[PDB]
Structure formats: C-alpha cells, structure tokens
Design a protein around this ligand. Structure first.
Ligand SMILES: Oc1ccc(-c2ccc(-c3cc(Nc4ccc(CNC5CC5)cc4)n[nH]3)cc2)c(O)c1
Ligand SMILES: [Cl-]
Length: 314
C-alpha cells in the first residue's frame, strides 16, 4: 500500500513548480483527480549508505502525521531518483497577509496561531526543530486548517549554498542564537519565530525586517536589549563577523512603545516568545494555555471546531 512500498509516478502529470520550497512540483493524480505536491528527494539510490539514511528520513516523515502538518502521502521511484509526495493545500498565511494590509481580525489570529503552536509542539515531542517558520511556509486549507511544511528532508541533502539561501530567506524570523552562529540551538528557536508572527499577523508589519545578519541583530537589540554573554562569545569567535562589532544602543524601543494600541495580553504573549535568553522562552504546550487562547473559552471551543473541520475537510 501507499504505506508499504515505493509507488510509480506514471499516474502523475506536471502542473508548474509550486511556490519558495526548492523544486516542489504541483501535480495531479490521473487516477483520483487529487492535486498533490511532489518534491525530488534523492538524486542517486546507488550510494548504499545514502539510501540507508534516506529511509531513515522517510520513516520519520511517515511518523510525523498530524492535523497541522502537511501529510506525506506516498513515496515514488523513477530510475535512480526518489520523490516524496505531499498533499496540496489551498494557500499560505502570506497570501492572507497580502489581502489584509492592516492585519488580520483578532479571532483569525487566535485560530491561526493556535494551530501553528499545536503543529510545532508535535514536532518538538518527536524531537524535530522546525527551523523554517515564516508566513510563506505556513499553508491554509479552504476550511481554515493550518498546515506547516518544509522541515528536514530537503535541508539534509542540501548544498552549502542552499543552507546559505535558507538563512537569507528566513532572516527576519531567526532567533538571536542562530544569528550569532550557535550550532547547539534548541527547540526554543521555533518559539522565537512564533513570537515574530504575533505582531506581524495583528499589525500587518514584519517585526524585525533587517537587510543583513548584523542589521537583524541591531533591530532585535534595539527592541529587546543586550544579548546574553554566551551569545556575545559566539559572535566574537564567528569568522562571519570578523571586523564587525555588536550594536551598542543608547535608546531601547520596547514593543509596547512601538505598538501602543495592542492589548497587554497580546504584548505579553509576544514578549514571552521573544526572550533574548532562549532558556526563558515558554514551551509550546504552555503557550496554548496563555490567557490569549483561554479567555472566553476560545481554546476549548476551537479544539472541537477544529476536529470537525479536519474530518469534513478530509
Ligand atoms: O522536505 C519537504 C519539502 C517540501 C515540502 C512541501 C510540501 C508541500 C508543499 C505544498 C505547498 C502547497 N500549497 C501552496 C503553496 C504555495 C501557494 C502560493 N500560491 C497561491 C495559490 C496561489 C499556494 C499553495 N501545497 N503543498 C510545499 C512544500 C515538505 O512538506 C517537506
Ligand atoms: Cl485545500
């Protein structure tokens, strides 16, 4: 079955390159009519140890089955190349943000955020750090079901140049530990990224839109103050930053000063996610029990709502 063995690509037709997401093809199932999204995973099966490691990744995808994650449907082979087949979701959060220049309605933000935190939380409990949270990487169904894509397979088989392209593309959402070169980052980098989406979704403005990694740090520190000493040490030892000094800042512009209309509950949520010290950020499950989701029983009501959406939407 679609779970047991490699399937064939004969039943698929190409419909233009999806997206952003590397080489991800939009295809249609000739037999079912189902529209799908196909990514090229392996170039060559030949390397015996390589294949060994690919099966390790595929096995993990098949175990990351969740309502708020794009589903891997099947794996196909053609010649020496392997292709992962994912579901095709209607649109992205970025698409909604471009229709709504003043930000999203409060309840739409609650529903999108709750789902994002839920999907990320599941990743963390399976020892996966998503590392690529941004509006374009968060898909939305016609029924409003959020689905996270792009977490691990393509990134491992990637060039030093693809690593570099990724870091540039996610620049605005990268936590300070990443920007200074901490290679022992943890799950907390996703929480930071979620923090970034809070004010963006409400205000229709990116939070820290820097032009470079030094400029990114500057935007972060102007709002949130000095980096922790561990981060300063990494910065000073990082060849990327040779001849560059960390921002000194006389005047901090705190978040509530920048967005004085935002309620204290919303500000509190963002600040929790945006701790400069990643140890001080909450974990995902704690976030879902913030007042922002719990006032007027939103989280409870919405969990039931979401379960019916999911079952009739799929
Ligand atoms: O390792 C990987 C690599 C790639 C993916 C991945 C899986 C699925 C998708 C995907 C994207 C997508 N839908 C989509 C993507 C972009 C747009 C933006 N254009 C708007 C519609 C006009 C709209 C819809 N459906 N499925 C994208 C990437 C993945 O899940 C894991
Ligand atoms: Cl859909």
């Amino acid at each position: 079955t679609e779970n047991l063995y490699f399937q064939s690509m004969e039943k698929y037709e190409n419909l233009g390159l999806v997206g952003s997401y590397g080489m991800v093809m939009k295809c249609r199932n000739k037999d079912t009519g189902r529209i799908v999204a196909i990514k090229k995973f392996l170039e060559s099966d030949d390397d015996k140890m390589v294949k060994k490691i690919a099966m390790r990744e595929i096995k993990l995808l098949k175990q990351l089955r969740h309502e708020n994650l794009v589903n891997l449907l099947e794996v196909c082979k053609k010649k020496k190349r392997w292709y992962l087949v994912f579901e095709f979701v209607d649109h992205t959060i970025l698409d909604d943000l471009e229709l709504f220049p003043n930000g999203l309605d409060y309840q739409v933000v609650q529903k999108y955020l709750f789902q994002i935190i839920n999907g990320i939380g599941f990743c963390h409990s399976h020892n996966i750090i998503h590392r690529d949270i941004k509006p374009e990487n968060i898909l939305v169904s016609q029924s409003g079901v959020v689905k996270l894509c792009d977490f691990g397979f393509a990134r491992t088989l990637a060039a030093p140049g693809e690593v570099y392209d990724d870091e540039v593309a996610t620049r605005w959402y990268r936590a300070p530990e990443l920007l200074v070169g901490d290679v022992k980052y943890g799950k907390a980098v996703d929480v930071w990224a979620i923090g970034c989406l809070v004010t963006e979704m409400f205000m229709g403005e990116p939070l820290f839109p820097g032009d470079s990694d030094i400029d990114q740090l500057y935007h972060i520190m102007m709002c949130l103050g000095n980096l922790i000493p561990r981060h300063q040490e990494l910065f000073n030892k990082n060849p990327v930053f040779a001849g560059v000094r960390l921002p000194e800042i006389k005047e901090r512009e705190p978040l509530e000063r920048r967005y004085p209309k935002l309620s204290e509950v919303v500000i509190d949520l963002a600040k929790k996610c945006l701790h400069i010290d990643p140890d001080k950020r909450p974990f995902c499950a704690e976030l879902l029990h913030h007042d922002f989701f719990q006032m007027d029983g939103f989280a409870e009501r919405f969990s039931q709502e979401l379960q019916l959406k999911v079952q009739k939407d799929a």
